[PDB]
Design a protein around this ligand. Sequence first.
Ligand SMILES: Cc1cc2nc3c(=O)[nH]c(=O)nc-3n(C[C@H](O)[C@H](O)[C@H](O)COP(=O)(O)O)c2cc1C
Ligand SMILES: CN(C[C@@H]1CCOC1)c1ncncc1Cl
Length: 344
Amino acid sequence: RLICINDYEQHAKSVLPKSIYDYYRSGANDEETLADNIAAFSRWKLYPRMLRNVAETDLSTSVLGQRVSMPICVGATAMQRMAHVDGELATVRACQSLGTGMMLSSWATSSIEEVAEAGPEALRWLQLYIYKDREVTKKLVRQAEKMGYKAIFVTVDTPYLGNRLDDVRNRFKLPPQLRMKNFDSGLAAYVAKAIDPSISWEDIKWLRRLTSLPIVAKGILRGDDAREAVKHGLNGILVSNHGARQLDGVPATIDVLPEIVEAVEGKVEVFLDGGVRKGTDVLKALALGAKAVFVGRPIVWGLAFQGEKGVQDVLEILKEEFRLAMALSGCQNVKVIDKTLVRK
Ligand SMILES: Cc1cc2nc3c(=O)[nH]c(=O)nc-3n(C[C@H](O)[C@H](O)[C@H](O)COP(=O)(O)O)c2cc1C
Ligand SMILES: CN(C[C@@H]1CCOC1)c1ncncc1Cl
C-alpha cells in the first residue's frame, strides 16, 4: 500500500469526511502559494557529488541546542483529534520513537500537560499565539516551562485568519465531542474574537522578557523582519507561509529561504516549513542554509491512516528518503550538505 507521502494523502482523502479533509488540505483563496510551495522545490536542481564514501550516513543534528535524530521535525497543526481519536498524543509518541521533536499547537485537541505525559522523553516545543487575553497567553508559556517544553514558536503571520474558501463553504467547526483543550468559517470567527490583531514588535519585547526559553519567530518571509527578530533577542526564524493558508500569493518558502539565511548572518538558526513531502526537499532546504525543516500536513495524513503508527510510518519514510538523498548526493552527514549541491 503506502510507500511515499503522497500515498498517505490519497488514503486520507478516501477515509476522512470531506469537511475535515478540506480543512487540512486547503490553502487561502485561489491556492496559488499552496501549489507553489511544492512546485518551487522542483525548480531547485541537485548537483550530486560522486565517490565520497556513504556507507556511514549520520542524519543526526541539533535544533536550538537539543539533539534530534534527523533534521525533520513535526510542525504545529491544530485539532489533530479530528484525524484520529488519539490526536496529539499519538503524534508525540511517534516523535519520541523517532527521536525528533514535536511542535504543539496552541489550538490542539489535547492539553500541554497531557502531551508531556504521553511523551515525557520526547523533544517538545510550544507554538504560541498572542491572545488579546495576555493572562491566558502567559499561562500557556508558564505551563510549557513547567512541563519541560524546550522552546516557544511564536506565530507572527496570523493577526487574522486567512480566507480558506472550502472552510467558508463547509461552515467549518470542530466535531461535537472535541475541544481546544488548553482554555462563515467558525475558525475565522474564533480568531477574530480570541487572537490580537494589534500585536507589534513591542509584544515580542514583552514575550522575550516573559520567558528565558528560546523563542523562534514563525511566519517570517522578509529579510528586514528577520533582522528585526534577531535585534529583539529571539533565537531562531521559522521561514513559513503558514502552509499557504494565510496571505495567498506570497512566495514559496524554499524561494525566500536564501534571503532570510543571508539576512541573519549566522546569528540564529533558520528553519523552513511549507511543501516538504520528500527526502530531496529536506536536502534542498539544508543546502540553502536551513538547520531543519518542519512538516505539517503529512503528519495529519499519518494520523488519519493509523494514529501513532501512521505518524511513525510517515516520519520513517521521510527519514529513509532523506538518507538516500544524502547518500546519492555524496553527503556522509548533515554538516557536509553545502550550497553547491543546489542551483535554480
Ligand atoms: C490543518 C493545519 C492546521 C494548522 N494549524 C496551525 C496552528 O495551530 N498553529 C500554527 O502556528 N500553524 C498552524 N499551521 C501551519 C503549520 O504549522 C505549518 O506552517 C504548515 O502546515 C507547513 O506546511 P505543510 O503542511 O506543507 O507541511 C497549520 C497548518 C495546517 C495545514
Ligand atoms: C542501507 N541504507 C539504505 C539503502 C537505501 C536503498 O537500499 C538501501 C543506507 N545505509 C547507510 N547509509 C545510507 C543508506 Cl541510503
